[PDB]
Ligand binder design. Structure first.
Ligand code: FAD
Ligand code: FAD
Ligand code: NAD
Lengths: 393, 394
């Protein structure tokens, strides 16, 4: 009968819920899952619908289908704030109560306080957002035939050359032949620009793979501006600093992949956070709070070996949920808990539909091999939450 | 030796060129065809791509494929003005000289000086235009999911309940189930509004056909506002006058089918025009110029029997091309020419993919029968200009 509530049905949230489903026995606890939408979207593949290389429906699944209900109660609503003292959470259309709290609200875009970014730029963070990005670009290409002078319609600027930016421009480059044919556009006129403040694309990554990534993307017509930061964002385009002087790029479409931050709700609810994320204990709990757990991008963990923190990823997020699910079972049964130890296997980044790069098991991988791996790994997630049934669909 | 120049590759233009092609024996005259694009689009079917019910490629064909290269020389360029005195036409990328001139530049949207109409509203008049309208609407639906409070995204206002407007709103209603499913939208929230200044939808049409049209469209959720004029057009929406008082409609998409005028080029070239169109003589030429011919929407014709003017249509435009081609051929070859006599067969209006209305001959038509009738008649044009080969390609 205790009331555990999980906030967000993302990688951290949905796995924690499914873990609880398998682990526990009917009526042992009251579990409620809260989500903004009635569907759970595969964030790792969201860059593809934004380009238009994949339908958005292939990147999402209905939550009710995943759960058997009765054990877990699903609430479709929007979280507003956290009342920790009165162990309750407030929604736009109601209020909920928790004995135990699991926080997996994912990330929010990090704008760095840059002017006009929130107003005039797009983010790849949801099914709704990527649909908007996709239709915006196609809309812009449609307008070009009427006004051939306006080449800014055909200019797409992606801010930041992180994994998200690199994956996106790769998909974008692949789409352009089909896109140009649809709207009678000269492929040569199209400009896809990736702008990176850091001196190198994909900073903190193996130079061998990075150069390979740039080489392939450069061949597909992607343009890279490195050591160039975005100072400001305008409706017309963006403003960048080159050689200590401001320069302007006129782009009808600006996508911001500059970084991510923890959900503002967590920080605004009075938690102590760094970059909006919580530095949790070995048991994935929020300091000074024995009944609160943080999962996914909201959680922050530091590798004891080095001084740097683990990056926010789906891979570690899945591991968060499974750990919390097991630990929650122990707490409900009055048992001890197990410290969280993250096993970070290789990471693979796609460079389009048929190409990819990654370091897996210490070994570097490229080409069709890496592409098949990522497709395989992503499919493994489908099996984890939906079984062979989900993989087929 | 003589230089025949044809302006525009629309219904009037393309048929006139093809008519000359069949009629003449090469080298007899120098024929040049001028078009804004290297393709000829089926304007009668343009309402479907704008809605998104049909691909735009099915509504156009390449001009070079249709014509006999050696006999007719095709120029892809944009007409700027016509110099009647010097008998030359000026383009963005050159100049051309004519002994005989055929003008089929089609129509331009008529805004009637209404504020913001040209700036903030869309027109269904080209391949480029319908693509813009289509992607615009899908874009607004995409934004709605993020902001469910903004129901104006799902509101589409079509100005004028003429022939074009009725076809467009009919196509739109059919699209909505597929469109709503794509962007997770509640169909009940969607509003398709047709605004008519006249007291009745489809003025000057059989009330029986009109009532059927409103009934079918009304069932699909289409809303009609009649006796209501559009005072102004804004990015936010439109302003309308109801019961002598101003009212507001919030619509992300505004499409203007309120009417058309002849191409501005004809008027700016010093021609004498009414509503931008030329009232031609029985030989479809502009008074008193014996060597200039006007075809399609640019031309204005009066029915001798009923004194009322013919509406600007593709059907009469096609007949213009055939008449001018025959008359031009006769003129260079010696003939006495033939006065233009329009044979106006029935007209059919689609009310969606599976429904239609029309008066053919003396009998009124409805349902799948009318739809098949309209589809067949449209196919006749494809055969006329492209043969069985063009007909195959859908
Ligand atoms: C294009 C892209 C590609 C990526 N590829 C990879 C990859 O290949 N490998 C890898 O390891 N990582 C990848 N990542 C990173 C990974 O997707 C994130 O780290 C992952 O989303 C984190 O899991 P999460 O559940 O905490 O976040 P999320 O998946 O975003 O969980 C958010 C969920 O909580 C809901 N929610 C949020 N706020 C509220 C609120 N106020 N009220 C109600 N519901 C709310 C949301 O609707 C959503 O359902 C990628 C990220 C992006 C953008
Ligand atoms: C949705 C819609 C549905 C319709 N359905 C029917 C129907 O069912 N039956 C019927 O009889 N009529 C119908 N009509 C009307 C018909 O389409 C027109 O009346 C017909 O096109 C008139 O012939 P036209 O060649 O003069 O016009 P157009 O087809 O518009 O001729 C214009 C051509 O010349 C080109 N051009 C224009 N300006 C320039 C320029 N400055 N320089 C170079 N090239 C230029 C254009 O690109 C185009 O190729 C419909 C119209 C619309 C909008
Ligand atoms: N295959 C994978 O494992 C995979 C794929 C995608 C994302 N991810 C993870 O998702 C997380 C989110 O990554 P992300 O791509 O959203 O951001 P990021 O933090 O990983 O990279 C941000 C980049 O943007 C640049 N940048 C920031 N501000 C800028 C500005 N004003 N102008 C120009 N450039 C600017 C930074 O230098 C940085 O290189 C990462 O931890 C990443 O590791 C993993």
């Amino acid at each position: 009968k205790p009331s555990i509530v999980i906030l967000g049905a993302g990688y951290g949230g949905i796995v924690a819920a499914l873990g609880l489903q398998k682990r526990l026995n009917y009526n042992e606890a009251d579990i409620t899952l809260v989500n903004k939408n009635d569907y759970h979207y595969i964030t790792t593949e969201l860059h593809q619908p934004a380009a238009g290389t994949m339908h958005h429906d292939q990147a999402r699944v209905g939550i009710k289908e995943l759960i058997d209900e009765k054990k877990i109660k699903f609430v479709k609503d929007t979280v507003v704030a956290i009342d920790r003292e009165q162990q309750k959470v407030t929604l736009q259309n109601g209020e909920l109560h928790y004995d135990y709290l699991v926080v997996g609200l994912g990330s929010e875009p990090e704008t760095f306080g840059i002017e006009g970014l929130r107003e005039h730029a797009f983010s790849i963070n949801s099914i709704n957002s990527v649909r908007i990005i996709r239709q915006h670009i196609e809309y812009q290409f449609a307008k070009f035939a009427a006004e051939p002078e306006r080449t800014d319609y055909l200019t797409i600027v992606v801010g930041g050359a992180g994994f998200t930016g690199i994956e996106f421009v790769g998909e974008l480059a692949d789409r352009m032949p089909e896109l140009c044919a649809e709207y009678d556009v000269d492929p040569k006129l199209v400009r896809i620009i990736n702008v990176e403040a850091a001196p190198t694309v994909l900073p903190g990554f193996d130079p061998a793979l990075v150069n390979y990534a740039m080489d392939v993307l450069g061949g597909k017509g992607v343009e890279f501006k490195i050591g160039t930061p975005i100072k400001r964002c305008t409706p017309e385009g963006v403003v960048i600093e080159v050689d200590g002087e401001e320069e302007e790029i006129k782009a009808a479409t600006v996508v911001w992949t500059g970084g991510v931050r923890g959900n503002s709700i967590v920080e605004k609810s009075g938690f102590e956070t760094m970059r909006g994320r919580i530095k949790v204990d070995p048991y994935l709990r929020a300091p000074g709070h024995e009944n609160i757990f943080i999962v996914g991008d909201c959680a922050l963990i530091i590798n004891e070996e080095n001084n740097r923190p683990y990056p926010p990823t789906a891979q570690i997020a899945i591991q968060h949920g499974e750990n919390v699910a097991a630990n929650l079972a122990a707490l409900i049964r009055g048992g001890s808990m197990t410290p969280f130890k993250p096993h970070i296997r290789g990471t693979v980044a796609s460079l389009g539909r048929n190409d990819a790069i990654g370091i897996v098991g210490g070994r570097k991988v490229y080409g069709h091999a890496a592409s098949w791996l990522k497709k395989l790994i992503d499919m493994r997630y489908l099996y984890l939450i939906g079984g062979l049934s989900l993989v087929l669909k």
